[PDB]
Amino acid sequence: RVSSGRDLNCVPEIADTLGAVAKQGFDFLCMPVFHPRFKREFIQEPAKNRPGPQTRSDLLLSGRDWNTLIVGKLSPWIRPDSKVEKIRRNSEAAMLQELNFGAYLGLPAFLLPLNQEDNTNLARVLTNHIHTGHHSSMFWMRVPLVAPEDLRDDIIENAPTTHTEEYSGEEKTWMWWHNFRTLCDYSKRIAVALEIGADLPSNHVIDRWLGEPIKAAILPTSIFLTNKKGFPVLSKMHQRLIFRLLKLEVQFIITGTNHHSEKEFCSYLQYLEYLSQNRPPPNAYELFAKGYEDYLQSPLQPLMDNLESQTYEVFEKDPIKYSQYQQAIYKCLLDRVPEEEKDTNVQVLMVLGAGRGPLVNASLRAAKQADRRIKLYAVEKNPNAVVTLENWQFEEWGSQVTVVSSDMREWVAPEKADIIVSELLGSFADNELSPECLDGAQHFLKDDGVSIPGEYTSFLAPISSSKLYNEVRACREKDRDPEAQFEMPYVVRLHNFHQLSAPQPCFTFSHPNRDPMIDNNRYCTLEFPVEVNTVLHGFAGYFETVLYQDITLSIRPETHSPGMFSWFPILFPIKQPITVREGQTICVRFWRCSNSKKVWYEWAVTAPVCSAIHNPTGRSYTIGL
Amino acid sequence: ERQLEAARYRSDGALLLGASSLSGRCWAGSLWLFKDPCAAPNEGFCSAGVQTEAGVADLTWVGERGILVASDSGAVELWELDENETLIVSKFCKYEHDDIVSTVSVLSSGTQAVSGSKDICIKVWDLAQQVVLSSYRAHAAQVTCVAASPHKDSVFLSCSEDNRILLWDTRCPKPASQIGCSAPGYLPTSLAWHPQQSEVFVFGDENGTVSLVDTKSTSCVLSSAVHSQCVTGLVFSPHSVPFLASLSEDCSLAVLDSSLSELFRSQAHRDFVRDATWSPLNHSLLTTVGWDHQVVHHVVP
Ligand SMILES: Cc1cc(NC(=O)C(=O)N2C[C@@H](C)CC[C@@H]2c2ccc(O)cc2)cnc1N
Ligand SMILES: CSC[C@H]1O[C@@H](n2cnc3c(N)ncnc32)[C@H](O)[C@@H]1O
Ligand SMILES: [Cl-]
Ligand SMILES: [Cl-]
C-alpha cells in the first residue's frame, strides 16, 4: 500500500474536512494552521492590537490526531526574504508564530516553500526555531522539480521563454535546496517535499534528487491525464518517476481540486495504489535487505574479533555463494587428480577460516560430485565456532575432517595442502586481511598448490548522498575526535544515493603470491569522469573475486553475483562534501597501510579540489592483525 | 463573519457586502445586500444574505442581479439574486482553480469574466455557458490582482508576486505584454483602470506607493508615497474628473486628485481597509469597509 496525504489551503470545519479526507482514503492532511489570507501585523499600530483569537483552537482534535494526522503549512502571505524591511520584520515574527504554534500542537511535520533563488533569511529564521529547544518537529521544504518561471506559457510578447539548451538553468531549483539545506548546516529536521509539474525536465535534473532526503512527492491533480473511461492517469514518464519515488518510500501528497469531476478523490489515490502494486515485486536481495537500507554498521573484523552464532548464521543462509564454492572445488579436483588416479590419489584440502563448517560441508558435496579422495582440515581461530565444528566432526563427518583450532598463521601443519579454501573476504575484499592471513598460511601450501580464491579485487565509485552524509555526521561520539566518524568505513546497503562514475578497481591480491618482495601495502590513484553537477559525500566500495577460473563472486553492481546476500557495499565517507561541475574529473587516492599490529586505509581527493587525508596513521580506524 | 472583504455599491444606491471568517472554529464566508446603506454592517437591518461553502477573497457585481465570487475553495461561484431580491441563490459553483481564487473582474461585455488565482493561472469564463474558455499560466507566482478594461473585452490587466504587470489582449497569438517602471520596482498589489482615458491606469505596490502608467508611453509618468504599508485596493470616483480612493494595510483610506496628491485621509478603521465603493447617488459619499467589521461613510470635499 502507499502512504498518501491530501494538501488543502481551504478548511471550513477541521472536524468535517479531516472526516472527508479520511473516507476518501488519505493517511494524513496538510492544512494551513492559521487562515492563509489572514495577514497579521506585529510592529505598526493599530493592526498589531487586533483582538484574538488569531486561529482555531487546539481542542478541536485529540493530541493523537495532531501528532499523527496533521501536517502544518506556513501561511502563503509570509515573505521573510522580502526586499521591503517592514515586510521582512513582520514575516519573521509571523513565521516563528506559525512554526511555534505547529510545535505547540506536536505536529509530525510542517511545510515551507522554496519558490525563489534567495531564501537566506527564511533559512536563518527556521535554523533559529530549530536551534531553540530539541523537539521531534520535522520540516518539509516544498521544492518544485521545475521553477514556475521556467514552466510559464510563452504568451508574454516582450519577455519570451528562451528555446536554447540551459543545462545549469534547468537545475536551478535543486541549487535553491542545496543552498538552503547548506545554510541550515544539514539539519536532520529538514527534508524535501518534491513538487512535480505537468512537463517533467531532462533525466539529468531528476537525477540530481537521488541521494536527497525526499520525505514527500507532491502531485497536483493537474498533471493527471484523463483516459478512455474518464479516470485520472499519468504519462509513462510520470509513472517511471513514481516507481523511482516508491523505492524511496516517499509519502505522496495530492494538492489542487478534483479536475476529474465524474469520479471521487479515491480516483487519484487509487491510480497511485494500482501503480505501486503492479511494480516488479521484490527480488531475493531487495526482500532480504529491506530493513538495512542506508543503515550504517561498523565492518566486522573476524580476525581481531570472534563472530557470534547469529553473525555466522546469515553467512551460511546464502546458498548461491556455497554452490559457487562447491563448483570451484569440483573443477579444481578434476584438473588436479587425473580420472585414472581417482582411487590411488587423495587430495589434502584445508579450509582456512572454517566457521561452523559450511565450506567443509561444501568441500564434501564437491568431492563425491567429482569422485576423488579428499582429506579435510578445518582450521578455525574462533573457539566458540570450533565447538560447533567438533560437534559436526564427531556426529557426522568423522575422522575424514581433522578440526584444527588455531590461527592459520600460527598452525604448524603436519602435511602440505593441495587446496586452501578461504571465505575471509569482506566488502572491500582485503579489509579483513585475507592477504596477511593467507600469506602466513602459504608456507604449508604444496609448491604447486591452488588457493580458492586465488584472486580478489576491490572497486571504488564516487557517490552523492547528503542523506548518508548526515547519517555518518550523526555518528559523532563523546571521548574521541569529533570528525573521527568520517575517517572510517561503514558496511551499508546504500539505497538513497547516486553513483557519479562507473566503479574502477582499487587493490588486487593474488594467492599464492609467489613474489619474493611480498608487500601488501598499496597506493592506487583513480580518475572518475563525472557528467553531472552533483556533490561528493564519499566512495562506494565493492569487490570481485576469482574462486578458480570461470567461477567468480562479486557485489560490484554491474557484475553482481545473482541472489547473493552475504555482503553489502562498504562506504568511505569524506569530512567536507565537495561540489563537482559537469565534465570535471574526481581524482581520489587510496593507500593500504600496515605495521606489525594494524592494517588501515588512508584516502584523499586531489581533484577537482583537494580534500584532507582521511585516517592518517590509522588514528581513527585500524584493522587488528 | 467579522472580516468584511468586499464593499460594492449597485447602480441604484444599494450596497453589496462580502465577508469571510479568518479565525475561530468555522473558516466560512457570506454575501449580504443592504437597500439601506447606512444600516450596515447590522445583520438584522439587511434586505438579503447567504452563507457560502467557504470564505470570499474578492467579489464583483455581474449587472443588477448577479454576484461573482472568488472562493478559497478554488471555485468561482455565481449567485443569482432572487425575483424579489429577498434570497441569494447559487447560479453555478465551478472548481477549476487548484488554490485560492484571489481576484475576479467582469469584462466590458458582462457575459464573460476573468479570474486570477494563487495557482498562478489566469482564466477567462463564459458566465452564460458556465465553462472556462481560456486558461493562461502567464506568471511565475500567485496572481495578486486582475482588472478588466472598462471599455474593451479582450483587454485587461493582471499583476502578480513575480513582480510582473501584464496588459492582456485576447485577440493576439501572444495575448500578454509586460509593462511598468524602468527597473524592477517593488511588487504590484492593486490595479485601477482610469474611467475616462482607457490608455492609462494606476497600480499600488507593497511599499505604499501608488504609481500612474500610460500604456501608449509605456513609461511611469507619475507616482506618490501615499501609505506606510501595502496598497490593497484602488477605486476611482464616478466624478467628471475623478478622485482616486487608495486602501492600505496601515488601516487608512486616502483620496487623491489626478496629480496623486493627498486630498482626504481617514483613520476611522482600526484594522485593515479591504474594499471601497463610491455612492452612485451622492458622488462625494464613499463607503469603506475593514476587518474591524466597520462600514464607515466618508463625506469627500
Ligand atoms: C564472509 C564474510 C561476510 C561478511 N559480510 C559482511 O560484512 C556484511 O556485509 N554484513 C551485512 C549483512 C549481511 C549483515 C552481516 C554483515 C555485517 C554485520 C554487522 C556489521 O557491523 C557489519 C557487517 C564480512 N566478512 C566476511 N569474511
Ligand atoms: C567465515 S568468516 C571468517 C572466519 O575465518 C576465521 N578466521 C579469520 N582469521 C583467521 C586466522 N588468522 N586464522 C584462523 N581463522 C581465521 C574466523 O574465525 C571466522 O570464522
Ligand atoms: Cl513541527
Ligand atoms: Cl562460515
Domain ranges of chain B: 1-301
Q: Which residues 115-134 of B have a C-beta within 8 angstroms of A?
A: 118-120
DSSP SS3 for A177: helix
What is the SS3 assignment for B76-96?
EEEEEECCCCCCEEEEEEEEC
Binding residues of A for S-adenosyl-L-methionine: 312, 321-322, 380, 407-408
Of A172, A177, A183, the closest CA to residue A211 belongs to: A177
Cβ of B99 within 8 Å of Cβ of A39? The answer is no
**C-alpha separations of B97 from A231, A375, B119 in Å:** 19, 81, 7
Burial (CB < 10 A; 0-12, 13-18, 19+), residue A1, is exposed
Q: Which three cell numbers stand for residue A374?
A: 579428499
**Residue tagged 559523532 (cell numbers):** A476
- The 10 Å CB-count burial string (b at 16+, else e) for B77-97 is bbbebeeeeeebeebebbbbb
B174/A contact by beta carbon, under 8 A: yes
Give CA–CA dist B253/B245, Å, rounded: 7
B144/A contact by beta carbon, under 8 A: no
**DSSP bridge partners of B200:** B214
B177/A contact by beta carbon, under 8 A: yes
Of A42, A41, A38, the closest CA to residue A9 belongs to: A38
Give A387 Cα–ligand 2 centroid separation in angstroms. Answer: 14
Cβ of A37 within 8 Å of Cβ of B251? The answer is no
Q: Which amino acid is at A3?
A: S
Residue B130 — left, alpha, or beta (φ > 0 → left; ψ -120 to 50 → alpha)?
left
Neighboring chain B residues of A60 at a CB cutoff of 8 Å: 25
Long-range own/partner contacts, residues A281-289 (CB < 8 A, 24 or more apart): A283/A563, A284/A563, A284/A565, A285/A563, A285/A564, A285/A565, A288/A565, A289/A493, A289/A565, A289/A568
B118 neighbors B143 (Cβ within 8 angstroms): yes
**DSSP bridge partners of B32:** B17, B49
Q: Is the CB of A423 under 6 A from ligand 2?
A: yes
The single-letter DSSP state of residue B98 is S
Residues 6+ apart with CB under 8 A from A18: A29, A61, A65, A69, A70
B270/A contact by beta carbon, under 8 A: yes
> If you classify domain A1-287 with CATH, what class do you get?
alpha beta
**Residue tagged 439601506 (cell numbers):** B36
Give CA–CA dist B155/B27, Å, rounded: 35
- Number of helices (H), then strands (E), belonging to chain A: the values are 15, 26
Of A105, A20, A25, the closest CA to residue A59 belongs to: A105
Q: Is the CB of A313 under 6 A from ligand 1?
A: no
Query: Which pairing describes strands A455-464 and A504-510: parallel, antiparallel, or unpaired?
Result: antiparallel
A9/B contact by beta carbon, under 8 A: yes
Cβ of B73 within 8 Å of Cβ of A10? The answer is yes
Give CA–CA dist B101/A355, Å, rounded: 70
Give CA–CA dist A115/B229, Å, rounded: 24
Q: Is the CB of A299 under 6 A from ligand 1?
A: yes
A570 neighbors A428 (Cβ within 8 angstroms): yes
Q: Is the CB of A302 under 6 A from ligand 2?
A: yes
CA of A489, nearest ligand number:
1
B58/A contact by beta carbon, under 8 A: no
Identify from A7, A8, A10 which residue to disrupt to test chain B contact, counting B C-beta atoms within 10 A and taking the largest count: A10
Q: Is the CB of A380 under 6 A from ligand 2?
A: yes
Residue A432 annotated as catalytic = yes
**Residue tagged 544515493 (cell numbers):** A497
Residue in A212, A390, A423, A602 annotated catalytic: A423
Give CA–CA dist A103/A164, Å, rounded: 46
* A386 phi/psi in degrees, rounded to 5: -45, -40
Write down the domain spans for chain A. 1-287, 288-454, 455-625
Give CA–CA dist B5/A429, Å, rounded: 71
Give CA–CA dist B148/A180, Å, rounded: 39
DSSP per position, A604-625: EEEESS--PPBSGGGSS--EE-
- Residue A233: CB atoms within 10 Å: 18
Identify from A257, A261, A265 which residue to disrupt to test chain B contact, counting B C-beta atoms within 10 A and taking the largest count: A257
Q: Which residues 97-116 of A have a C-beta within 8 angstroms of B?
A: 115
Length, in residues, of chain A: 625
> Which residues is chain A interrupted after (C–N above 2.5 Å)?
none
DSSP SS3 for A467: helix
Residue of A286, A290, A292, A297 best suited for mutating to test ligand 1, as the one with most atoms within 8 Å of CB: A297
Cα end-to-end span (Å), chain B = 33
**C-alpha separations of A436 from A321, A423, A598, B49 in Å:** 23, 14, 11, 90
Query: Which pairing describes strands A373-379 and A346-352: parallel, antiparallel, or unpaired?
Result: parallel
Give CA–CA dist A327/A34, Å, rounded: 69
DSSP SS3 for A125: helix
For domain B1-301, give the fold. Answer: Methylamine Dehydrogenase; Chain H (2.130.10)
Of B17, B31, B132, B145, the closest CA to residue B75 belongs to: B132
Helix axes A319-336, A358-369, angle to 10 degrees: 50
Query: Which pairing describes strands A570-580 and A534-548: parallel, antiparallel, or unpaired?
Result: antiparallel
CA B8, B14, B18 angle in degrees (round to 5)?
Answer: 40
Give CA–CA dist A202/A181, Å, rounded: 23
Query: Which pairing describes strands A251-255 and A4-7: parallel, antiparallel, or unpaired?
Result: parallel
Q: Which three cell numbers stand for residue A562?
A: 545473482
What element of type H or E holds A24?
Answer: helix A14-24
Chain A residue at shortest CA distance from B118: A76
Q: Is the CB of A509 under 6 A from ligand 1?
A: no
CA of A108, nearest ligand number:
3
Q: What is the resolution of this structure in A?
A: 2.8
CA dihedral sign, ordered A257, A263, A269, A272 = negative
Give CA–CA dist A430/A17, Å, rounded: 60
B69 neighbors B60 (Cβ within 8 angstroms): no
Strand locations in A365-444 (E): 373-379, 401-404, 417-421
- Residue B129: CB atoms within 10 Å: 10
Give CA–CA dist B200/A326, Å, rounded: 90
**CA of B114 vs chain A CAs: smallest distance (Å):** 16
Give chain B's radius of gyration (CA, Å).
18
A373 neighbors A341 (Cβ within 8 angstroms): no
Nearest CA to ligand 1 atom 6: A567
Residue A436 annotated as catalytic = no
Give A464 Cα–ligand 1 centroid separation in angstroms. Answer: 23
**C-alpha separations of A165 from A117, A168, A201, A237, A363 in Å:** 20, 9, 12, 21, 61
* A88 phi/psi in degrees, rounded to 5: -55, -70
Provide the greatest CA pair distance for chain A. 108
Give A513 Cα–ligand 1 centroid separation in angstroms. Answer: 26
Neighboring chain B residues of A255 at a CB cutoff of 8 Å: 98
What element of type H or E holds A437?
Answer: helix A434-440
Cβ of B95 within 8 Å of Cβ of A255? The answer is no
Give CA–CA dist A597/A401, Å, rounded: 32
Cβ of A35 within 8 Å of Cβ of B23? The answer is yes
**CA of B281 vs chain A CAs: smallest distance (Å):** 32
A190 neighbors A141 (Cβ within 8 angstroms): yes
Query: Which pairing describes strands B66-71 and B56-62: parallel, antiparallel, or unpaired?
Result: antiparallel
The single-letter DSSP state of residue B187 is P
Q: Selecting from 3.30.465.10, 2.70.160.11, 3.20.20.80, 3.30.479.10, what CATH number does the domain A455-625 have?
A: 2.70.160.11
CA B9, B11, B17 angle in degrees (round to 5)?
Answer: 20
Q: Is the CB of A431 under 6 A from ligand 1?
A: no
Binding residues of A: 312, 315, 321-322, 380, 407-408, 423, 432
Chain A residue at shortest CA distance from B29: A12
- Residue A237: CB atoms within 10 Å: 11
Of A362, A357, A361, A351, the closest CA to residue A327 belongs to: A362
The single-letter DSSP state of residue A223 is G
Residues 6+ apart with CB under 8 A from A291: none
**Residue tagged 565456532 (cell numbers):** A385
Alpha helices in A77-213 (DSSP H): 85-104, 120-130, 172-183, 203-208
Cβ of B118 within 8 Å of Cβ of A55? The answer is no
- Ligand 2: which atom is nearest the Cα of residue A424? 3
**CA of A156 vs chain B CAs: smallest distance (Å):** 5
B70 neighbors B94 (Cβ within 8 angstroms): no
Give CA–CA dist A104/A112, Å, rounded: 17
Query: Which pairing describes strands B122-126 and B112-116: parallel, antiparallel, or unpaired?
Result: antiparallel
Interface A:B, Cβ pairs < 8 A: 135
Q: Which residues 72-101 of B have a C-beta within 8 angstroms of A?
A: 72-75, 95-100
What element of type H or E holds A236?
Answer: helix A236-247
- The 10 Å CB-count burial string (b at 16+, else e) for A495-508 is bbbbebbebeebbe
Burial (CB < 10 A; 0-12, 13-18, 19+), residue A423, is buried
Cβ of B272 within 8 Å of Cβ of A39? The answer is yes
B114 neighbors B97 (Cβ within 8 angstroms): no
- Ligand 1: which atom is nearest the Cα of residue A493? 11
DSSP per position, A241-310: HHHHHHHTTPEEEEES--S-TTS-SHHHHHHHHHHHTTS-PPPHHHHHTSS-BT--BPPP-TTTSPPPHH
What element of type H or E holds A311?
Answer: helix A309-316
Strand locations in A475-533 (E): 490-491, 498-499, 504-510, 522-529
CA dihedral sign, ordered A252, A256, A261, A265 = positive
Q: Is the peptide bond preceding residue A512 cis, with omega within 30 degrees of 0?
A: yes
What element of type H or E holds A389?
Answer: helix A383-392
B144 neighbors B191 (Cβ within 8 angstroms): no
- Ligand 1: which atom is nearest the Cα of residue A311? 15
Length, in residues, of chain B: 301
Cα end-to-end span (Å), chain A = 49
Provide the greatest CA pair distance for chain B. 53
Cβ of A153 within 8 Å of Cβ of B137? The answer is yes
> If you classify domain A288-454 with CATH, what class do you get?
alpha beta
- Residue B189: CB atoms within 10 Å: 25
Give A302 Cα–ligand 2 centroid separation in angstroms. Answer: 6
Neighboring chain B residues of A43 at a CB cutoff of 8 Å: none
Q: Which residues 274-293 of B have a C-beta within 8 angstroms of A?
A: 291
Query: Which pairing describes strands A251-255 and A214-220: parallel, antiparallel, or unpaired?
Result: parallel
The tally of CA atoms less than 13 A away on the side-chain side of residue B45 is 8
**CA of A181 vs chain B CAs: smallest distance (Å):** 23
Nearest CA to ligand 2 atom 16: A353
CA of A298, nearest ligand number:
1
Neighboring chain B residues of A153 at a CB cutoff of 8 Å: 136-138
Q: Which three cell numbers stand for residue B285?
A: 459619499
**Residue tagged 581481531 (cell numbers):** A304
